[PDB]
Amino acid sequence: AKTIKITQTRSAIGRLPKHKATLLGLGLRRIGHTVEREDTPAIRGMINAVSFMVKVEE
Amino acid sequence: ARVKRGVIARARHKKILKQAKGYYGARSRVYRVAFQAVIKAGQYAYRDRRQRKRQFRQLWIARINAAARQNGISYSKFINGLKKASVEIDRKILADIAVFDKVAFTALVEKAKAALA
């Protein structure tokens, strides 16, 4: 899980398909922008591809 | 049915030709200047004002690093002391205290030196 409250990692346009997984998906725009999603399993899927990539901190 | 360009013809050239500085040779006398040079001016200008915000900062720290270190702790350690505070954080710029209120500044280096855990 661990997805409740996540701020973007730090990267402009460079990925290929993960951008849908995040910016176009999760709802993150520009770095540092944090989003707070629910705390259920279904969401972990998105952060996984971007594991060390994104930043979920607490 | 009259373009009679003459009518704005003049006003346009005159407009850009209005480069007081004169710059040098053709750079005022000839229309050639305008979009060649008057245009460069606009370009060189576009970046310098915004790129300048830092060129001074580079100076601000250049002097703080040159003032604060003379009395213990380098600029690297300075802002770190300063860093620890509840309200104590007044940024640089005014940081030039080293020029007018030396006593303040050196009384401010302790606010950091003695501050560094």
Partner: protein, 103 residues
Amino acid sequence: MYAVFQSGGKQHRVSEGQTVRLEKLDIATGETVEFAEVLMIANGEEVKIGVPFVDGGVIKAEVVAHGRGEKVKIVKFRRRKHYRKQQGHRQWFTDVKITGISA
């Protein structure tokens, strides 16, 4: 006594100095309402008691004068690639003056 504060840039180096700043909000015209700044004060910093903080007791602020909040400045500022030219543009503010009483 010296002065010090931020609000749209740390512009508060000079003592009283009456220097430009930012803008009220709803409107500018002059007069006043008596707006104390905040204890960003360098303790005012100015006397036998120049203090590292600025924090030298609760409440310490100067009242805003509101000298003249108008004017602009105009700067062309125009970019252009090799096929275009946004060359045509302009954005300014009025920076209200403010004299500021004593610390």
